[PDB]
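tool=predict chain=A
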Amino acid sequence: GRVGMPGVSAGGNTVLLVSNLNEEMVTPQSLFTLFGVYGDVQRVKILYNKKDSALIQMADGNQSQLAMNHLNGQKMYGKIIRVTLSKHQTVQLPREGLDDQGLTKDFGNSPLHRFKKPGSKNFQNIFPPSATLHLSNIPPSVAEEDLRTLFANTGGTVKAFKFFQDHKMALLQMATVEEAIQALIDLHNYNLGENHHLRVSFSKSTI
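tool=predict ok
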């Protein structure tokens, strides 16, 4: 085992509340890979009842408070993206994963992620943002010829792409860290190929 303490850095709540959204990226995979790159993630949900808000579910023990503090005011797309630890009961999704309505997203199957606890490929339980964007996914149906249109809409003006010649993985460079985080988030699920974005993330390397 690796856990058994009588508590954790959040409390055992497995939830993370968010506000001040743009309603233009805080719904699809983009938000899910946001909290999915800033740590482990259990689920997602969105709400608009007389107020714009959303909710994520996480491992609430060493990444939800970090992601909370750093995303609570980073304006990486055009909004304060307010964030806090939640204060109410967890979600329930007794349905297949969409609560038969769609405002919920039991995407915990991580169909675009392979994150794990510290011990390999990570040693900080989260990933800090940088202008460099390392990945695994380079399908034969999207390459520079379509990645051009992708980065041409992410936020920067480079996404310098460099890829292997004996594997299916690569790396990208945005012009700045803010558009870097928002660019790999925006394209984290954009390739439409057999590798269907195994992942994109930050690295110490450069291009």
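The domain at 1-108 is CATH 3.30.70.330 (Alpha-Beta Plaits). The chain has two domains: 1-108, 120-207.
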